[PDB]
């Protein structure tokens, strides 16, 4: 609550990793426990 979130906001491919794979230390959460 108070930020509040979308459905499929942030969900269009976020990363703008393209040529070889993405990894520039800022948004890692790909999938740790769970």
């Known amino acids: 609550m108070g930020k ?3 459905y ?3 969900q ?3 990363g ?4 070889g794979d993405m ?3 800022m948004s890692k959460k ?3 426990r769970g």
């Open 4 to 6: 509040a979130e979308n």
């Open 12 to 14: 269009v491919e976020l």
């Open 30 to 32: 790909k999938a740790g």
């Open 23 to 25: 990894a520039a230390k």
């Open 16 to 19: 703008p990793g393209p040529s």
């Open 8 to 10: 499929e906001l942030y």
